[PDB]
Design an enzyme around this catalytic site. Structure first.
Site, short mmCIF file in Angstrom:
data_model
loop_
_atom_site.label_atom_id
_atom_site.label_comp_id
_atom_site.label_asym_id
_atom_site.label_seq_id
_atom_site.Cartn_x
_atom_site.Cartn_y
_atom_site.Cartn_z
CE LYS A 1 -2.81 -0.11 -4.19
NZ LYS A 1 -4.23 -0.48 -4.19
N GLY B 1 -12.43 1.14 2.28
CA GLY B 1 -12.94 -0.22 2.09
C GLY B 1 -11.94 -1.24 1.43
CG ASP B 2 -9.00 -4.35 0.90
OD1 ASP B 2 -8.39 -3.53 0.17
OD2 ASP B 2 -8.70 -5.56 0.91
CB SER C 1 -9.18 7.14 -1.27
OG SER C 1 -10.01 6.01 -1.23
CG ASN D 1 -16.67 -1.33 -7.67
OD1 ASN D 1 -15.64 -0.84 -7.20
ND2 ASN D 1 -17.67 -0.60 -8.20
CD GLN E 1 -3.15 0.82 0.29
OE1 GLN E 1 -3.44 -0.34 0.15
NE2 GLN E 1 -3.55 1.76 -0.54
CB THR F 1 -10.94 0.35 -9.01
OG1 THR F 1 -10.95 0.93 -7.70
CG2 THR F 1 -9.72 -0.62 -9.19
CE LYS G 1 -5.84 -3.37 2.49
NZ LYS G 1 -5.81 -2.72 1.14
#
Lengths: 449, 449, 449, 449
Positions: free
Chosen positions: B113, B164-165, B380, B240, B110, B209, B125
């Site tokens: 990224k 979210g995840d 985000s 999604n 993360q 995404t 995370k």
């Protein structure tokens, strides 16, 4: 809605001693019948029962000393009604009549008004039974400091942002902010709105309410395939809102022909449309004389003492001053005159009998204050944005957003009313649009508040 | 790099019981060899040794009651890996498999990224071994409240912003936010992202995404003097990300021809390019049936049960669903089909054997997920900006920035790879661009973290 | 208890990679069978399932620079296991072997030990894999500062009070406290215990553990209608605890005849009962030589290299040094010698095989360390009281309370064991008394933690 | 006092809708006439006008879910009346009748009661209109958690310490404390009193009120050169206070001969003086049957249904149960019986008509509840001291201080009344002693509050 009906009955009974609050709840909840009936899920989480109870109420003692060294004691209030969609926000009112009932009512309504703006703003109201009339500048300052010395702990830029109201203007805001910054030891100027420019105030803030009320009326003309131009308007007061309206009306091709005072009201068939005419209103306001006569004296226009301008024949009626200004007695005269446009600008300037009455009239257009006067809260949200960005927007920027949003508030209200089969009912439409966002937010946030 | 090699060896040994974490570190550090060798100063301050250890790890107990009154106990995690360049940021995952190893691996990735987005965002995370499957809405709510009652103290808009995840969507975010605002006593809605619009959510967030992954592919076509138009794409899932991709592909002149499910996969040589076709995916998702078949039933298109769509001949492969979806077995079929474009979209959808294999193939273009799926974290960051400005941007604004940044992530990655003499290696390029910003920031901040 | 058995099985499986923790849970929970069976209500609120999961775990990065300017990176831990009955409390251990498994085990046990003291103290443990061996004073200082720079935010006098343990003594406490006061900007010296007197340390703190272990043995003699006087004791180490014990034994009419070192062990049939003899131990400790031989050299007493003193015939065995010092091999020799008193003083100085074995022996008295060494945590609670009152108690005051409580811990343990029909089982008795208070507190506090 | 008279007139008018509050102010202020007249300086700083307004009032929404999943909404209150001499302190009452009027009245009185104890304790009261009757343990728990989730931010060990009252006992305190510690992340157990021993509760807390009321009566006998021994007492209830009184009376040579219930009242000419007799009261309380009959059934003693024991001839009358238990009707019977001792124990157990009446009786001794029942708040202050010292006092210590202070409250009250020439007027005496400390403190602190 049986559900809606039940909640109103419970309110009426539990808050019997808070008549102002009870009436407001009934008036607002009764228009949501259709929406609630479409969402059974609301009742399952006691949505309405939660909404009618403020999240948090704070009352506190306020001792202060006058210029003679005498000690006085007043009571401070802050009702933080609903914060589902933004930091609580709402004016402070300093008037000897202030009590919890009145704070709750203005605060419940504030939540709905703030929701309509489309900005992230919750709803609150506060104030004191302190009477600023006859106090020196220094006495008002000491009171504001004592008031803030307790209040500061309950508010903040991401928590609760107070603003001006009756008895609280730029001066009081300045003094309260001075005490706040000193106690907290930082800037955080987004803690209050209605500030002077030197420390973060927004351009167009003085004009906001009046101008916004005219951009709304314009959206109404458009809906009705009509036009402001040529239109004549009856105003009330010679104050800030009246001044802002006259001004934008003039600029728009319309003209106000009346102004009012506790002393009577004036008629100026020419229109208060001149720089000279318009600016004088500021003069009269300044004077502290409190006489609408001065305008007629000055301009040599009719002055009818102890009389409301609601009898004059005009195209548009805009009460910009006091509560329950228009009663049944005034509505009938308005009706008899065949005025199609009835536009509330001031807060609750019409009694309910008068309201129902005007609403029963098939040919009229009646706009509720919570939607029409939203331009002032809208500029308060823009000031908070400017303070968060740490810069100032230009006057063209603020005015242009003001304008687009006011149009949207009218249009969304009509669309909503229409969808629940209510016709062009701008009054229910405002309530509905305001309610929906709040409900969405509360449903998504669960049962915490 | 001997230095890089040494750090990997130490990790392998110290965190032997955290296989997922070890593998990720090796994979990432091994591509930085060239960069590290160019900066001897890194080793002098033990830069890599610091980076591989999260700044802060929090694990906590989470007791909660179900609808039957029975008490359950789960464990909550938040790994705040690296905050050199912004508040920590990263999704929350609710799945029975969650443990520290997995949080660290997703959290280390993360950080890289988030660095690529070019926005000020650190990496983190978190989640719980709580399994939302088979729970009521009310049970998920109580869990989210209990979870936030401890977590709130470790996060905040300028500290750590969860999102979210797997297992955490708009609903869970709403409930967690509700508890947060109630405990903290303020708004601070920038504390979480993925919110509903009513309380601060951003336009384009659901599409982010999927759309972003297509804007990246577009930058790839451009690099390769090729074109999306006409192109056919194999997708995975009907979720999604799959929905967002199909949509933008369609709009762009391309078409997806496959979708997948745990039940098999479908082929639709026409393309899932119709409003009807596209929207139905949302239907299937909604249904909660979990069957890609429904699409074939509905449209009368081929459904091959218990089969991965990796055997179909298409121009572009985009795994949008699950980890280690593509194994060696699937890579060989892909290879045998002469597909040039291999674009990871879902997180780690390819096993390492499969990855090396595809990367050894001289004619292919392989894009890593950390870069390709950055559009979601990008939206985000835009939501956090909107919440800080206290306003909403329009959909055109968000989409246009999304688009320009996705192109930049591809272009910067290629440029970086190229500069260290690696050719068009988008995989190493992502790692390198991500690493450089973080290293700059840590070198400048000294030895504190 | 089927319930107890189930929780152990779940632990064994979920925390397979934390052997130390698993074993401790089994050992402790397995003795509560009778108590749990008497309280069905526990299972209804998942009491045991909650207890086995720490309330909060914090791990963090710790970069620091050595005297040569080289940068090192270690990991810091604080496991806040249970705070139902007081602020979390527990030592900090600096040793290269430290990992989460070990912190959890020491921390789970700490909760039970702290509960026995009868003071309001929760349970926690923390530390770092930092190895203080071979570091300069200045290097230890810089590490302690870097360590506290993150830890300070998780602890505090009413939150979590750390204390010394392996690798952490007065010196480290002083340095950590120095950094704490500087960051927080206040005194709050009750934040740590084991402090020097100049800034709030308590009289009797160095003697606490050793003395307390002898007051406990005294309560055992009394129970068994026996006497310390004349009694001979085998000790381990020549450290703080050994020094404190020898001292109080001597004063009491008893005598230690052995001491031990990594080099072997010494026998002194006269007894380490002289000011000269006793004080020298401090000498040897000081020296930093790490040789029990020096005592035999100095006094001309037997020194058996590479040998444990567990073979000597004495009345009482008190292992005061290292974990798993006594194995089956040593227990058999102890058994063969017909020693009735087996008193653990150091933490876990006996392996479980050895433990079960000694416990199977019908004529012996086996006392668990968690109860016997409680004098040190007891003085830590008295230091916190003194710091809260902002004064110092006299040495007679501290020693007298120490003494009465140690007797009570023995007596309550026996009474508890007896009540659940376990006979004079001081091991289960400690667990039970410790558990009951904690359970009462958690049952009363509801399902929050 | 004209000043006193003016403040009462202003109160009566401003708080017309708060009858309970108005009456309490009049009753209390009217006895201070003599003191106020002796201190002209009070009026100069508007001392009384400040005192009658609480420093801070908080009301908040309380949504909670029942065992069936249904959502309920109640209202929470905390009135922080006066903190001049200590942290605010006062019980929480859960009863459907609770409203602001009642909180203010109990809270105004609390300030005076707390001042008499001689400990540093301000005055406050709070609660909810939540009705615990018919709720499960689990429902009460969820309510307590929701209630504390907002309240925690307004209280704290050095700020406001709540305690039990009607509807709030050890169980509710335990649950509220559990939520508090979890949200705040620390121990701070001095935040509430009435806790269970396992987490900081004080010995003698259950006996405190009843015992303290008897130590006060003893000080009365002494004043009147009389004696408890031989004395017979009429009690009301069979509750905690009744139980504590009977017990200490018995031990003292006296005996209660009556108990009461909603069902009637019992007469036991022998005296509820046996372990068997006394302990059974706890039985009846436990049962949850709510029948004083059970005692007569069990012991075969007279039970007069639907009758108040105020008609029996005894030496001392002690109403230990409900407000306005003794009306004019009961006072006349008491008077006609020639009872000299009238001792209020429960809160406001006598109507004002009845009170004036008894006070007009020249031969009687009438003691006000605010002084007589101070033993419970006294033990709450000792619990706060114990929690601050982080230790427990023995039962002999608490009881001995309890005893000396109760005697002092009586003696100081008599001395005060006497000094202002009021004779042995324990009612005015309590008010005066309570008022003086508070006034001293406010005069010294200036005009801030």
């Amino acid at each position: 809605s049986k559900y809606v009906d039940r909640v109103i009955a419970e309110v009426e009974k539990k808050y019997a001693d808070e008549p102002e609050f009870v009436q407001t709840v009934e008036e607002v909840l009764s228009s949501l019948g259709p929406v609630v009936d479409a969402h059974p899920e609301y009742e399952e989480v006691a949505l309405l029962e939660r909404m009618v109870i403020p999240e948090r109420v704070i009352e506190f003692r306020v001792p202060w000393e006058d210029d003679n060294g005498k000690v006085h004691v007043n009571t401070g209030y802050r009702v933080q009604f609903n914060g589902a969609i933004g930091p609580y926000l709402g004016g402070l009112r300093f008037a000897p009549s202030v009590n919890l009932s009145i704070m709750k009512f203005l605060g419940f309504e504030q939540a709905f008004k703030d929701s309509l703006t489309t900005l992230p703003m919750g709803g609150a109201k506060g104030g004191s039974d302190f009477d600023p009339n006859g106090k020196s500048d220094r006495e008002v300052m000491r009171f504001c400091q004592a008031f803030m010395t307790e209040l500061y702990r309950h508010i903040g830029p991401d928590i609760d942002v107070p603003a001006g109201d009756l008895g609280v203007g730029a001066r009081e805001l300045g003094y309260m902010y001075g005490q706040y910054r000193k106690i907290v030891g930082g800037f955080y100027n987004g803690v209050l709105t209605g500030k002077a420019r030197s420390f973060g105030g927004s351009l167009v803030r003085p004009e906001a309410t009046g101008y916004g009320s005219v951009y709304y009326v314009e959206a109404v003309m458009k809906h009705e395939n009509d036009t402001l131009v040529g239109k004549t308007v009856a105003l009330a007061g010679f104050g800030n809102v009246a001044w802002g309206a006259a001004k934008k009306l003039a600029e728009l091709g319309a003209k106000a022909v009346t102004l009012s005072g506790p002393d009577g009201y004036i008629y100026d068939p020419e229109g208060i449309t001149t720089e000279e005419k318009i600016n004088y209103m500021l003069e009269m306001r300044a004077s502290g004389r409190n006489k609408v006569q001065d305008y007629a004296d000055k301009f040599g226009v009719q002055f009818f003492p102890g009389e409301k301008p609601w009898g004059q024949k005009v195209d548009i009626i805009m009460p910009c001053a006091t509560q329950n200004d228009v009663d049944l007695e005034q509505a009938k005269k308005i009706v008899a005159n065949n005025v199609k446009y009835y536009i509330e600008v001031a807060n609750m300037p019409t009694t309910n009998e008068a309201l129902r009455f005007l609403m029963q009239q098939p040919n009229m257009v009646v706009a509720p204050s919570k939607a029409v006067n939203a331009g002032g809260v809208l500029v308060s949200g823009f000031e908070m944005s400017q303070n968060s960005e740490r810069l100032s927007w230009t006057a063209e920027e603020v005015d242009s957003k003001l304008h687009q949003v006011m149009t949207d508030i009218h249009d969304g209200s009509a669309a909503a009313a229409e969808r629940y089969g209510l016709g062009y009912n701008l009054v229910a439409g405002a309530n509905i649009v305001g309610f929906q966002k709040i409900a969405d937010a509360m449903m998504a946030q669960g049962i915490a508040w």
